[PDB]
Design a protein around this nucleic acid. Sequence first.
RNA 1: UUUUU
Length: 231
Amino acid sequence: VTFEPPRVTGFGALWIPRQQRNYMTTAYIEKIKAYVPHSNLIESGLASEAQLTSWIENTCRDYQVSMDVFMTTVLPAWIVNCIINGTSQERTNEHTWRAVIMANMEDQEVLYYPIKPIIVNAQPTLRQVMRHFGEQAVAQYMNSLQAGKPFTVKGAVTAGYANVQDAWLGIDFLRDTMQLTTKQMEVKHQIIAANVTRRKIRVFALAAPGDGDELDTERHVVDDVARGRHS
RNA sequence: UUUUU
């Protein structure tokens, strides 16, 4: 059997609906084989490109800083801060998030930035807009680990995970789109079980009272009953 | 989907 044919017939076992049999050709197979987009650009768990750039442009206008200096200077600081403290929406009560200027592995001064103009501008929640930087956050935490002064991950410490070697997987903005092995899947997921620590209520206590009974009277008569004379 | 202050 020097030659063993070529097959490559495709389809066969794969059931094809009758409406698609006229377009489900062999040449159609090769056309869709090229459509393999990144598995981190299609899911709804992250902000889309249209609303990611909206977040980038809106927050730099509020800070009155250029996009070039935003993507270079304060974005890594924001990623580090989101590594230290969580990325929850109700972090706005801090009213300020801190960035520290570093001279040579030694703090010199802490800078203060408003936290509202960076959370509300993330249209599909800030937990989703920061998921694009989840892969960069792990690398930056590893860099901090190599420097001898590891970061303190809020999720890992809160969940009870004291392992500093892999204290990530406690990052609040990991979508798990990365090829996590089965031994890190449960470590990340048990940390994710910090959600059941606190409840959530969907609706507040309404607006003010619509009405509490009204009054309408005039003239000179009894206190409340207008000329009460019936029997 | 949200939910990890």
